[PDB]
Amino acid sequence: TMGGDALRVPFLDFATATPKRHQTVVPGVGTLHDCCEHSPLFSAVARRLLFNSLVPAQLKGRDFGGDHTAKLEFLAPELVRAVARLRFKECAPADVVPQRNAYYSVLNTFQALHRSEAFRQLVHFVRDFAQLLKTSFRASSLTGRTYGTLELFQKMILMHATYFLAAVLLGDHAEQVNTFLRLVFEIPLFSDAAVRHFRQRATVFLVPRRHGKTWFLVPLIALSLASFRGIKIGYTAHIRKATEPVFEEIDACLRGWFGSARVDHVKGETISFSFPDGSRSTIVFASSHNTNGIRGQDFNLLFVDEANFIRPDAVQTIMGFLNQANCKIIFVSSTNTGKASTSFLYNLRGAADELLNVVTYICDDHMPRVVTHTNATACSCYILNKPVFITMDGAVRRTADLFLADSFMQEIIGGQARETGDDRPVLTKSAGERFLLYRPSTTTNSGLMAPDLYVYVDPAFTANTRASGTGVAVVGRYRDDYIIFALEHFFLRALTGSAPADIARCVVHSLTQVLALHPGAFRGVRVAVEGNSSQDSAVAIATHVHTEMHRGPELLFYHCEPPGSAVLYPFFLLNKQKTPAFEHFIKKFNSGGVMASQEIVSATVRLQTDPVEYLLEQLNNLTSDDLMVAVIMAIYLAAQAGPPHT
Amino acid sequence: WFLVPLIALSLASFRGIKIGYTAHIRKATEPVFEEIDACLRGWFGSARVDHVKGETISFSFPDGSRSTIVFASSHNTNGIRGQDFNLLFVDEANFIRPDAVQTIMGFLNQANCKII
Amino acid sequence: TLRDTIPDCALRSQTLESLDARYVSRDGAHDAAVWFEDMTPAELEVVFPTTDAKLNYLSRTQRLASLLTYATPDTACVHGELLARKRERFAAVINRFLDLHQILR
Amino acid sequence: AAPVSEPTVARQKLLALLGQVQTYVFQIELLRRCDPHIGRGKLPQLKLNALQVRALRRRLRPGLEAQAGAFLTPLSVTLELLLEYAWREGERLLGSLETFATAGDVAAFFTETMGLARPCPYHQRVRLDTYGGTVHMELCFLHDVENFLKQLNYCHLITPSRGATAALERVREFMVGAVGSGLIVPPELSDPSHPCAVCFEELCVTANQGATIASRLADRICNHVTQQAQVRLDANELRRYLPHAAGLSDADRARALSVLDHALARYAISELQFWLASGDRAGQTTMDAFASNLTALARRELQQETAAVAVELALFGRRAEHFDRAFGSHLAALDMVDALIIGGQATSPDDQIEALIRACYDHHLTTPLLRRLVSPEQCDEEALRRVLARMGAGGQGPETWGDIATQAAADVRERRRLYADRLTKRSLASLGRCVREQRGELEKMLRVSVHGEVLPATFAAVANGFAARARFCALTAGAGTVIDNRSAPGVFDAHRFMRASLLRHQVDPALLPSITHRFFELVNGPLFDHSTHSFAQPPNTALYYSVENVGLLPHLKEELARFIMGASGADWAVSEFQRFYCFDGISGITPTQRAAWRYIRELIIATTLFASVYRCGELELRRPDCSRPTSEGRYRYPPGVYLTYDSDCPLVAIVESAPDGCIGPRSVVVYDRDVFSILYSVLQHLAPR
Amino acid sequence: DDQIEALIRACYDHHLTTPLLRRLVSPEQCDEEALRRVLARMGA
Amino acid sequence: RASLLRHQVDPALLPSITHRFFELVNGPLFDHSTHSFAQPPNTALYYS
Amino acid sequence: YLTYDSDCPLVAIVESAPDGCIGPRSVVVYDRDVFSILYSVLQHLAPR
Ligand SMILES: [Zn+2]
Ligand SMILES: [Zn+2]
């Protein structure tokens, strides 16, 4: 009842040489220098050993030492006998008079939290939850694996409920309660941001088929009612034929491990728990969706069970509840992978943050299901109960034959194949978003640019095909980063007599615009025409570019001496340098080092889509690629290699 | 939150008034019933709390006296004939209740009625 | 009773190891006190008269020193490269944090 | 309620001593930057403090030695680190001060103490030394201790006991140098880009909107192995505390104030233009506001500097040369960024963030895209309301400039407005994340970072497992009747008999979950517990944590999750006669761990089939890494069959230990390598009872 | 039994098929799926 | 001052602080907050 | 008490009397500053 021995210690008036203008008082210890508060290595040990006393013995764990939390408060007997004969100084009288007052007063605010029934409510709630889950949720009396386990979401929901109920019922102790719920959830070392995250309201949960969805909320409610005093948990659902089961499974245990006298029950409507001193907390059911729920007083929870297909004409009361000042609409749901996208709720991930959490076992790409494989529960692993009739196959071929969506389900066919084949994304979404949004204005920061332009043309010499696009990129150095000045995704007119000149006219038009937008900026432009497709056709493009540009900056072409030849052709052959180029790009792009000019030029990609947005769609295929290749290679050239010339 | 204590104290103190309390659709009037009778029976004796569901509530006094809060929320009858109403606590006149303005205009004819 | 070390030594013309062997390492040394003297110089408190002010200076000089040591020919230290990369990323991040808010207007 | 236990007042005494030692290390880190002539004044105080720290050991030495071998705790780890860093840096600084007053030069004193001529003493060699192959790593940074302790945690069933507690003494030797100060972290050994082990649980527990953790973990600062300490510093801090000083009982406290007022009445900002600049130049800009703010900060810094110089001159008589002045020439030739990262001994590193925010946020920004930053919760709430409401119901090719220039001008005229309307109408959710991420990445770089409580906690959590294993290996050797069976004069018969009698039965496929759980419980390590909490979690999750932190190839998670999913005698019995835990013919790290998974599966399935066939025995398959010690020197190992992970004598069967728990004279135990001989010896005991 | 293993390892490789391979490794799920199909076809 | 500036204002207490601010700032003439039928201190301050 | 007097604003009456008046058992603390007032109040109310 009195807790642990860490909140009853004597004075231990050691000493101090620091002036009172500096010394601070850490609770549980004496008065130390101020520098002991900016050092977390001490202010996180001297504070955890205090709240490790408020934590009851039913919450330390399962094998933690008989008498204490050995993993926090344990001193070897030799060390205890050695520090026993250690004696500090003795405080001066005129200094011990106020020091003892400061010490025993900074500790009173802890021996005062251990008494307030507002905090005892939380302690009782958590301790009863733990002791009653020890034996998995059943019809026990509350008086080889034998201990039940909360899965990840079954713990995130409990945290979302408990932190909010604590922040609501305990406002005057918003500091002594956070660093106690940390110890009680075995979640220390957790920055205040990722714990204040649980203080927010309306956090949606998307859960697979069963996962003990309903089996967990009834004990949650039964313990959040008979422990706290003054809350009315609204519990809506789908068609009310499913809510009466919740009635029965709540009242069976709520009357099971408690007295029936305090169980107040009306059929099809509110349930109320009464307390021995004129107190009552209820679970009023907003499932009626008509009345008795519009006026909100102390709801604060609104346990919406299934928001997958929202109940007809029941969103008005929910939106009215959203107006209540202290309501945290938990918004449980169940996407059983039968649809895999409750797009009524799954569209929330578009423009929101820290709102919804999905308990999924297959990623967006359905190939790296093995990402979340060791997390999938072992209870839901049943098979035909026969590996093979007669076969000697490795687990790979077995799982290929026994794929069935890797969970005995019939998940969507197509898109990401069944054999993963080491398929993954390459450029992070975060770098991609910044690439789209932050575009330096090059026309007004020309001093930041290098005086050389690099252009790569990756030609396709066919028409009336989707992979017949010619990619062009013109890039340069911007500070020590790389910036794109122009992009083209050019499609030959069918049966032209001058495909190389049409391509050349396209690139020349792009260059010109870039030159005109930044006059006098560039001393050199270096041009590479990929020749893998056709060397002659690549040479012809270079020749037309050469001639047209002849109408200042010097124009140079990358040249190539093909194997067995002594001739230097103005084309570029893409082979061994592809992997280094791509590798460097990916690293640069992901760290924020490649960007697009705010006044990026594109004649071919202007009416239907934003050129940077279009490039990014191609780039997100890294694991029609003419534009991506031109951009990556133009940048590689601006990077480092052998000299290109006149 | 303020009108229920107002009524609970204006009933159990004066003797001989019948406060009419209309409202919107009668699904909102039963909450007023409950919040009036919970305290009216809370800080007083239940014997003097006379209550019929969906209709009038009456407080009785130890010497042959009774003052009521007869609910004109029915909007059909039991409110047209006025004797000692004098208050007619119309709760929400923002969107007036359908076909309920006739009884209100008849109450306006009563000689000592103050339609709040 | 249980006197400190400052009333014990009383003489400060020697080396540290001699005093160790003479006062704290003798078998007969009673060793019945723990009291850390105040080592901050008043010539430094009168200018940085605040633990926050004595910590900001203690961190600024630490950053300076860590810049100076990393700025016979080994030069192949990962810490120099880490400091260089951190400085470059910080510059590039502040670069795209003033311009981004210039654009938003 | 009056009697408080000794390990409770001893902990308070140790906390007080830790506070005193932390204060002393603060004073040491201060004296390493003060003028030597002033430091020499505190030479007797520093000598006495070093004597006190020396005498503080040689008493806590045997205690902490008996502690390091039995269940380290995050208290006596930081205490060891600080009592070592004090005993190191105090003597080092004292040597550097007694070297002074002989050479009498300051610019060579701040190269000894501050370490400007050292060979970078932040390198170490670990040499994990597992079975099969001794992989070796070097500990260069702070996250490089986390990534090594997690590796040693994951590779614990593969690593010898005394080959690990001898590679942890090599980690502590580095931590004493790096995290030993516990008060400030040098910018060299701090990479906030690399996520820690506790900011992986953050993403697992907080809300994820799709976006699997492998992609969310790459946009993190991890904020836990280093913190920010939120230092604030007033404006007129020198004038406040001037009329109140330690000494100065004379009226000189008034003439000093007079000289301060008289001297008060008496950053390379020219480098911003070479940064990228957008938009219109004429008029106010973000760059102009930033330049004005930085000019104000520089003016305050210069005023504070001149006031401090005047006060030191008027009070003591001599202008002191501290570190920031003796090397002040290097604070002049400093670029904008190299002097923005460091700097501001008068202002605070939060004042630079204030000067940046006051420049990027004025009244002219916008109505939208400004409220989402000041309230990122109302934005998502409004988005939820909106979602709920919506779900409720040719030719003439020109050559000259006059035409191509005009068409390019028109194209850029369209596109400069295109994205400008993107950044304002759409893309609010992306901008509200990009700006709140760049601001965090800035404040983490500018604010004074001190130290995090992660390393001295995970170090203890890892070392406790190996300590307990080596303790159980040696506590059972001294017991009652020992039946050590590593010598096999007549054991082949009883091994083959039991192996045949157990391989005759099927695995009872109704028990495969109770076997997969006890497999994920043995394979997991001691750091990531997540299965003995009060709010426990399935052992597969406690293993997913411990195996995803140390980046494991995805092609090995199926080999772990689907290991006992298939369970005849094939893939059932892998051990030879006496080579149960022997890795002689296997090298590497992953193919040496598959061989350990095989032995663990064999042990588990053999124990299950033995419990099914010979119902007499119970065979609680336990692990010695559990059973943390109680109040003092008691471990109470219950009966069972311990794995012990030791290739010397792996299987230890404690059949009848004691009626109270300890291991003494009534504690007959059976040592053996092989599993089936262990089961036969257990049967020969438990059956005739 | 090693000869049966040598025959099965020859007749069953990773290239056989997606179907006609799961019905051997689980001749119960095949009939269960057939029952589901029959019930769904006879329902409507 | 250091031991108090180390804690946040506990934003769940801001109404109980705004009330005790409008109660100190107000003057003695317009009372309107110690009547039997009292009124919020912000009204007693709006009058004054 | 605030007392609004720039001469000696803060007056802390920590233990006045069991009946209300201010007499010989009415230790009071005069001060300008607030934090020193709080320290003097702590030095009295804590050891009780
Ligand atoms: Zn180094
Ligand atoms: Zn982290």
Numbering used by the authors:
A (entry chain A): 35 to 177, 195 to 602, 614 to 685, 705 to 727
B (entry chain A): 266 to 381
C (entry chain C): 12 to 82, 96 to 129
D (entry chain B): 2 to 267, 306 to 432, 478 to 651, 654 to 775
E (entry chain B): 389 to 432
F (entry chain B): 583 to 630
G (entry chain B): 728 to 775
Direct quotes from the study:
Examples include herpesviruses and most bacteriophages, both of which replicate their DNA as head-to-tail concatemers containing multiple copies of the genome that must be cleaved to generate unit-length viral genomes. The terminase complex recognizes a specific sequence or structure on the concatemeric DNA and cuts it to produce the free end where packaging is initiated. Acting as the packaging motor, the terminase complex then hydrolyzes ATP molecules to translocate negatively charged DNA into a space-limited procapsid through a dodecameric portal.
Here we reported the atomic structures of a herpesvirus hexameric terminase complex in both the apo and ADP•BeF3 bound states at 3.5 Å and 3.6 Å. To elucidate the structural mechanism of viral DNA packaging, we determined the cryoEM structures of the hexameric and dodecameric terminase assemblies in the apo state at 3.9 Å and 4.6 Å resolution, with C6 and D6 symmetry respectively; and those of the hexameric and dodecameric terminase bound with an ATP mimic, ADP•berylliumtrifluoride (ADP•BeF3, a nonhydrolyzable ATP analog to mimic ATP in physiological conditions) at 4.3 Å and 4.6 Å resolution, respectively. In our structures, six copies of the ATPase domain are arrayed around the interior of the ring, forming a “funnel” like structure with a central channel. Remarkably, a large basic patch of six residues, R291, K292, R306, R313, K318 and R331, that are highly conserved in herpesviruses and bacteriophages, is observed lining the central channel, which is believed to bind DNA during translocation.
